[PDB]
């Protein structure tokens, strides 16, 4: 199944933050409106916050996360969770190798802000 | 129900990161084995990261998040999500006021690392 | 925090299913737009499906689960999870006593149907 | 990523329930320690419960859900959610066709029981 694609409420600010846990340098692309809106990158085996940004979900609300390691696309896993019918998290894990920890880049999207 | 309490595997490193979305200055305390192991504070209305740290679950694996504003405990909401049977997120939201957005401090715990 | 309340898309069909795990008879009421739309009662300590029904979220999309034992409301825990940006679960646990297993009645809402 | 595989605590009872939402008969296999422990078959486009059973996770704790239609493996999506650090749900969706609703057979695993 497609992973890493989330429908947010339209025209709504959201936070996006990326963590790294791999020997490989991670590159995280965040697409809004099917166009790159943010790119994060780094290399850590200790959960470094390689990037964090506030974005707007735009007219469609479609947000997509993609991860690559030296130009090679990582496999993704994702889900969305809603607490008290108000607080949203869209979660992505990615795997760049064979150990299937899916933590090589971890991405968290949260909304609402403010 | 109690919220913000998680059982991790023993002696396991985990990431904890906090974001603020409030006029109130947030204090986030992360307890491991019922003792404060990390404290973060900050104030933002725009999802600023107010702390990130890697901790060890220790012998107990008992992790608890507490949030306060002006000496008063915030009301918490929380859940744990597991993706592809491997990637764990422990998620916390907190409410310091009356609008029930539950994003006043947002805490994300993730493991495994590395 | 309020628990057991979910906003579904308006005019959407959804399933609701209740399980019991208690010495006490569970009464599960499912409200749509604040009016009772389905009720299930039963006693099980072996996860019997005390009822399942299909409903429509109607104009409001507001769906609420209540659980009581002999007229006393149980404490509720809940969350909503979305898989592959399409498949939704709204999850409820309830505690009618002191052991905090939160399984005394378990209620699962799923959509879309068909 | 692998989907539909869950690690439960060893030697623990769990509930498994399957719903159908497809014009084709669904066949759901539940494997414990890589061996068939339950099979459910049924057809509904209205969320009928096609099977429900209580199983034991046994010595391995390894539970896997597979779904096939008319012989052919359906694509799966899954996750596990824990509420109040006590109540577990393992959730599976499956897609047998072209619409990507992932509700063709829906499987819900819950523990603990009793
Ligand atoms: C009602 C819809 O049912 C769809 N499933 C099928 O159409 C399906 C399942 C197996 C077969 C089937 C078998 C044998 C030969 C053929 C070819 N005619 C086809 O068709 C679901 O995917 C969809 O979401 C909807 O619920
Ligand atoms: Ca890896
Ligand atoms: Ca890794
Ligand atoms: Ca607030
Ligand atoms: Ca706020
Ligand atoms: Ca109980
Ligand atoms: Ca019970
Ligand atoms: Ca389908
Ligand atoms: Ca279907």
Numbering used by the authors:
A (entry chain B), B (entry chain A), C (entry chain C), D (entry chain D): 1 to 114
Sentences copied from the publication:
In this study, we evaluate the potential of synthetic fucosylamides as inhibitors of the two lectins LecB (P. aeruginosa) and BC2L-C-Nt (B. cenocepacia). LecB folds as a nine stranded antiparallel β-sandwich with a Greek key motif and two β-sheets composed of four and five strands, respectively. BC2L-C is a hexamer that displays a double sugar specificity: the LecB-like calcium-dependent C-terminal dimeric domain is specific for heptose/mannose, while the N-terminal trimeric domain BC2L-C-Nt is l-fucose-specific and binds histo-blood group oligosaccharides, such as the H-type 1 antigen.
Co-crystals of LecB with the dual ligands 2 and 9 were obtained with a resolution of 1.55 and 1.74 Å, respectively. Both complexes were solved in the P21 space group with very similar unit cell, and one tetramer was observed in the asymmetric unit. In protomer D, the fucose moiety coordinates to the calcium ions inside the carbohydrate binding site for other fucoside/LecB complexes. This coordination involves the three hydroxy groups, OH2, OH3 and OH4, while the methyl group at position 6 is directed toward Ser23 and Thr45, forming hydrophobic interactions with them. The anomeric amide nitrogen forms direct hydrogen bonds with Ser22 and Asp96, while its oxygen makes water-mediated interactions with Ser23 and Thr98. The aglycone part is oriented so that the furan oxygen and the terminal benzylamine point toward the solvent. The phenyl ring conformation is imposed from the crystal contacts: it is stacked between the side chain of Asn70 from one symmetric protomer and the main chain of the β strand containing Ser41 from another symmetric protomer on the other side. The terminal benzylamine of 2 displays a direct H-bond and a water-mediated interaction with the main chain oxygen of Ser41 and Val69 from this last symmetrical protomer. In solution, the aglycone ring could adopt other conformations and stack on the LecB surface to optimize the interactions in particular of the amine.
